[PDB]
Protein: procathepsin B
Amino acid sequence: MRSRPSFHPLSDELVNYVNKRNTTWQAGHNFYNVDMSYLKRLCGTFLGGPKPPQRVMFTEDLKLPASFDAREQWPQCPTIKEIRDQGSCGSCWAFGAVEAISDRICIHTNAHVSVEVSAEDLLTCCGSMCGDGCNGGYPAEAWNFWTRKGLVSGGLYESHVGCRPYSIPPCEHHVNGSRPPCTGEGDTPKCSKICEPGYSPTYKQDKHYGYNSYSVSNSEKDIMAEIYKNGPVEGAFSVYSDFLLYKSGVYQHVTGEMMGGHAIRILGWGVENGTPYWLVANSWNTDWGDNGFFKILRGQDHCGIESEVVAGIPRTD
Structure:
């Protein structure tokens, strides 16, 4: 083994090609002046590991809709619209986890009470359990740590929102070459069991605990029913070099190298011109894709999209 890290990103010919082929999506340049170490740490999820049981979806007598956008169902739970940034930290497994966890609280805690769960608290305080912090991690075990120990509040970098807000700064990858090259590097922040000054409750007071962690079957129908009945879920999929260039439409892998495994948050679905899809949000800001979101081919375990859906339900009262 010998992973060769370097640079010289996603060409134009890659974009141009993806277009001339006429797949269900159109490319463009998202990352500019970025180091391939960046693009890699961006995809920070290992695939498989410790699948949590199986939410035996009671599907039979549940006339699901043809299309659905969780942002439109629960409009009072804004966490659903929010797109985050993992920085050059393969903290995405922690991201899909807390992004959804955040929604579901507002949804199950009486669709009326929002809080941004700290991707920092989980990223830094979990441990081998979840894996390697910014170097990759197990989505399954994020949910599990939530249920296990809980997660305090904590919004975007320098947002000053919550117990522990993400201290890892984002890089302007979607812009200018005059600034510093975005090298995907750094280390995992140290687990500081303490909220920032200004915010009250304390840390222990602020910890939100889940009730259980579970796997949604590998079934389009089942996944749809988890999302409809309980809100967004967290999945994962293999990122090929062509995906980083996604701009709009329904993503279907055409060309590209197997960059790595990256986690996600599925919040909806639909059909875009005879092309069924899943409405998913990313952890690489609002400049990538369509306002941070992208649509991937549904019902074909495309890139493993429907094979790692883990979800959880919060503890009542």
Summary: The chain has one domain: 1-317. The first strand starts at residue 25 and ends at 27. The beta strands are 25-27, 68-69, 210-215, 233-240, 246-251, 258-271, 276-281, 293-297, 310-314. DSSP finds eight helices and nine strands in the chain.
